[PDB]
Design a protein around this ligand. Structure first.
Ligand SMILES: C[C@@H](N)c1ccc(NC(=O)c2cc(Cl)cc(NC(=O)OCc3ccccc3)c2)cc1
Lengths: 39, 156
């Protein structure tokens, strides 16, 4: 039995930690909903 | 049960103790999450029940109590925030510039942030606080890191 618990409001936060790069990747999506890298 | 708009943890007591299997968004009386989190199973909210309403394994999305309500989209230029809800840890916003998943059917935004598998379903927001998609379905790249698509449904 799965259950849910509240974790917070959905809002933009000014001066939040900024991180992460922006890669451009060639991908394929299969009938099972799985992404794979195409090379 | 609780129907107030917001981000929610998805938990189970089947395994050892209480385990967080994913995350979801409550908006307009509808609960939105990724298909791989619940497998389409019913959910409990206190003493109330949430029954599945729509779902699709290929999109990896599911809605409870009503049709999919989230219809905002990434503009293709601006930074976004992942409102990450990791297991056992406080909700935390992380700002990032999304990359791109290029497919035979078009391009999709992608976020290159590393989090445990139980963080799947955490919402990605634009500067107006609108949910532009959910985090949790993507790929593993050369450096072992995870890159998730910005997965969004369609509002009928
Ligand atoms: C059923 C199918 N549609 C499906 C089912 C499930 C999933 N998603 C996940 O399993 C998932 C979700 C998230 Cl948020 C993170 C990860 N993590 C991950 O793979 O990490 C590897 C790693 C190694 C070394 C260093 C850093 C990372 C996985 C997608 C699709």
């Amino acid at each position: 039995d799965m259950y849910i618990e509240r974790a917070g409001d959905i809002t933009w936060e000014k001066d939040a930690e900024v991180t992460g790069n922006s890669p451009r990747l060639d991908v394929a999506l299969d009938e099972s909903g799985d992404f794979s890298l195409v090379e | 049960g609780e129907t107030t708009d917001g981000v929610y943890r998805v938990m189970t007591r089947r395994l050892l103790g209480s385990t967080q299997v994913g995350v979801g968004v409550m908006q307009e009386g509808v609960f939105h999450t990724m298909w791989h989190v619940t497998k389409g199973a019913a959910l409990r909210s206190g003493e109330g029940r949430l029954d599945p309403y729509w779902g699709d394994v290929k999109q990896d999305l599911v809605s409870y109590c009503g049709p999919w309500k989230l219809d905002a989209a990434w503009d293709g230029l601006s930074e976004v925030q992942l409102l990450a809800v990791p297991p056992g840890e406080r909700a935390k916003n992380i700002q990032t510039l999304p990359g791109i998943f290029k497919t035979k059917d078009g391009d999709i935004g992608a976020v290159a942030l590393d989090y445990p598998a139980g963080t799947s379903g955490s919402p990605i927001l634009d500067k107006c606080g609108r949910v532009i998609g959910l985090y949790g379905n993507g790929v593993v790249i050369k450096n072992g890191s995870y890159v998730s698509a910005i997965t969004q449904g369609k509002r009928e």
